[PDB]
């Protein structure tokens, strides 16, 4: 609608993206072979009350062993936070690309 709103949405996607990546990292089982490796994923999230739950996870590319660990880590996240009354931000957060690393 306006440039200022676009800036806010872009900022919020970055902020929540980082929150989500941290939640995944906290659940990730650490292994030496993951050093310097990454797994790129897409999350589709389903709004659930005040937050969101996992709908689907797509592994885009990355280290095979780290990606397997990432799948379990994502499956172990209790909930993903969403902003209150910011539907345009929620639209982007419901379909989000993340990079997971140890």
Partner 1 sequence: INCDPNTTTSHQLLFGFGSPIVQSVLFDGCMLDIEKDDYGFVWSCLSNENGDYCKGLYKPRFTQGVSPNWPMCDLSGASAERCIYPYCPEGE
Per CB under 8 A, 60 contacts partner 1: yes
Site track for partner 1 across 11-50, x = CB under 8 A = -------------------------------------xx-
Per CB under 8 A, 92 contacts partner 1: no
CA–CA distances in Å: residue 102 to residues 46, 49, 61, 74:
26, 30, 15, 14
Q: Least separation, in Å, of the C-beta of 67 and partner 1? A: 9
Report d(CA 28, CA 49) in Å as an integer. Answer: 26
Report d(CA 65, CA 32) in Å as an integer. Answer: 11
* Site residues, partner 1 (CB under 8 A): 48-49, 53-60, 68, 71-72, 75-76, 78-79
């Amino acid at each position: 609608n306006n440039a200022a709103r676009q800036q806010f949405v872009t900022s919020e996607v970055g902020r929540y993206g980082a929150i989500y990546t941290q939640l995944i990292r906290q659940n990730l089982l650490v292994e030496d072979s993951f050093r310097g490796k990454q797994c790129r994923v897409n999350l589709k999230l389903i709004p659930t009350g005040t937050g969101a739950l996992l709908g689907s996870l797509t592994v885009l590319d990355g280290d095979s062993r780290l990606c397997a660990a990432t799948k379990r880590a994502v499956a172990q996240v209790n909930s993903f936070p969403l902003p209150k009354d910011q539907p345009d931000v929620v639209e982007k957060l419901k379909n989000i690309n993340l990079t997971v690393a140890p």
